[PDB]
Structure 1
Amino acid sequence: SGAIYVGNYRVVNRHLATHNDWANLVWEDSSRDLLVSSTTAQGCDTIARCDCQTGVYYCSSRRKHYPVSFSKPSLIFVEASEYYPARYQSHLMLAVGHSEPGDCGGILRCQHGVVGIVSTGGNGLVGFADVRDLLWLDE
């Protein structure tokens, strides 16, 4: 679990969005596993606007942060799960690192700010949904 809170927006994995997220929907994209909802309180986070490919993510299944090298956002095949059919997920970045079911929502940050959130994983892989292209989060 986990979310980004920036301005009057809350960014979560679309597959973990709550009834309240959907009732205050701003934007969602199943192909990216992202959903943004509106908030009444001002958010605590700031978004990176950069091309970094290294950073640090929070892994809830280890209660620890790990450094990662990750690929540029791209279209990657993701196997079927209870949440989605087998499909290509866009704006996804892969890295070698631990992740397991429950770790989605953990933040990936570089020196500039929040880069994205955990969205997929595999045998020693972790995948992050990029948010750096969502310029409107800052306005």
Structure 2
Amino acid sequence: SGAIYVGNYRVVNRHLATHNDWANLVWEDSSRDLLVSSTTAQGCDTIARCDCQTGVYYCSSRRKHYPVSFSKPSLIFVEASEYYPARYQSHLMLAVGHSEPGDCGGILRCQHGVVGIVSTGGNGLVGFADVRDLLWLDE
């Protein structure tokens, strides 16, 4: 579990979104596994605007942060689940890093701010849904 709070927005994995997220929907994209809902309280997370390929992510299954090198956002094949059929997930970045089911939602950050959230992995890999291209999160 986990979310990004920036301005009047909450960014979560689309497969983990709640009834409240869907009743206050701003934008969602099944191909990115993202959903953004509106909030009453003001969020203070800073979104990174960069092409960093190094950062640190929070891994709940180890209660630890890990430094990682990660790939550029791209279309990557993802296995079927109770939430999606087998498909290409867009704007996904992979790193060699552990992860298990509930790790979805952990933040990846670089020196500039929030880069994205854990959305994939499996077999010793973890993937991140990138949010750096969503320029409207700041306004």
The alignment's TM-score, normalised by the length of structure 2, stands at 0.99
Task: Give me the whole-angstrom Cα distance separating, in 2, the residues matched to 1:122 and 1:101.
Answer: 9
How many correspondences in the alignment? 139
Q: Distance in 2 between matches of 1:40 and 1:122?
A: 36
- The CA deviation at 1:123 is 1.1
| Per-residue deviation, 1:53 | 0.2
Q: Deviations over 1:63-106 (max 9, x none)?
A: 00000000000000001011100000000000000100000000
Structure-2 separation of matches of 1:119 and 1:94: 10
Structure 2 residue aligned with 1:69: 69
Gaps of 5+ in 2: none
SS of residue in 2 equivalent to 1:61 = helix
Kindly report the root-mean-square deviation, in angstroms, between the aligned alpha carbons of the 2 structures. 0.4
* SS of corresponding position for 1:102: helix
Partner of 1:95: 95
Could you tell me which residue of structure 2 aligns to residue 4 of structure 1? 4
Q: Distance in 2 between matches of 1:77 and 1:97?
A: 18
SS at match of 1:20: helix
1:122 Cα offset (Å)? 1.0
Corresponding residue of 1:119: 119
Structure 1 unaligned spans of 5+: none
Secondary structure, counterpart of 2:84 in structure 1: coil
User: How many angstroms apart in 1 are the aligned matches of 2:138 and 2:60?
Assistant: 27
Distance 1:113 1:81 in 2: 30
CA–CA separation in structure 2 for the residues paired with 1:120 and 1:72:
15
Structure with the higher fraction of residues in strand conformation: 2
Q: Which has the higher helix share?
A: 2
- Give the equivalent residue in structure 2 for 1:47: 47
Deviation at 1:44? 2.4
Return the alpha-carbon distance in structure 1 between the equivalents of residues 134 and 20 of structure 2: 22
What is the distance in 2 between the residues matched to 1:15 and 1:9?
Answer: 17
Q: How far apart, CA to CA, are the structure 2 residues paired with 1:123 and 1:63?
A: 19
**What residue in structure 2 maps to residue 36 of structure 1?**
36
Structure 2 CA distance for aligned equivalents of residues 52 and 107 of structure 1: 15
Equivalent residue of 1:85, what SS?
A: coil
Instruction: Give TM-score, length-normalised by structure 1.
Output: 0.99
Measure, in 1, the Cα distance between the counterparts of 2:59 and 2:68: 12
Q: 1:12 & 1:126 partners in 2: Cα distance? A: 17
